Design a protein around this nucleic acid. Structure first.
Length: 162
DNA sequence: GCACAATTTAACACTTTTGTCAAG
């Protein structure tokens, strides 16, 4: 369940607070619907209360989960196919998937490769867009704007952030 | 869309020609 003021995630919307629940008229009878808003978008969202766990509606990590993610961010890697197709495809799916542990785990190998040989014009967006959801997630949990939030990664990276 | 061989270009170290000056 999600109360009015719960801090949640709605892929790929990064983070947003739930405003409440309402009966939206969809087709036939109106099932209950959760409401996820994003002030840094001015968008809007309606999430069915039936199976919230099927839309990948997770919740912002707690301040306790910062170090673990950082540790899997600095070191943790993972092999990927050589031809750009499968590799970038996988990375993309992982991105839209909305999984901070997987996005960070990915960011690790992507980082190891970026300063070695160097990152293709594709995997670059697959890195940037990856660090984006992270930097904002940190801003949701620790309530510190993308300035400070991005200032976090600098430690477990070795370099600053864009 | 990308790794890369192919070929072009700007890069530059340096040699030789050509305009030039004070003095016969």
């Amino acid at each position: 369940e999600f109360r009015p003021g719960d801090k949640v995630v709605l892929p790929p919307y990064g983070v947003g607070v739930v405003a409440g629940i309402a009966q939206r008229s969809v087709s036939g009878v109106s099932r209950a619907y959760y409401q996820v808003d994003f002030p840094g978008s001015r968008s809007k969202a309606y999430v069915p209360v039936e199976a919230p766990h099927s839309v990948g509606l997770r919740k912002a990590l707690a301040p306790e989960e910062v170090p673990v993610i950082l540790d899997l961010l600095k070191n943790g890697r993972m092999p990927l196919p050589k031809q750009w197709a499968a590799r970038h495809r996988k990375t993309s799916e992982i991105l839209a998937d909305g999984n901070p542990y997987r996005i960070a785990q990915m960011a690790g190998q992507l980082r190891a490769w970026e300063v070695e040989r160097g990152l293709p014009d594709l995997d670059r967006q697959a890195l940037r867009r990856a660090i984006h959801l992270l930097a904002e997630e940190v801003a949701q949990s620790l309530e510190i704007t993308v300035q400070e939030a991005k200032r976090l990664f600098e430690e477990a990276w070795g370099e600053e952030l864009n």
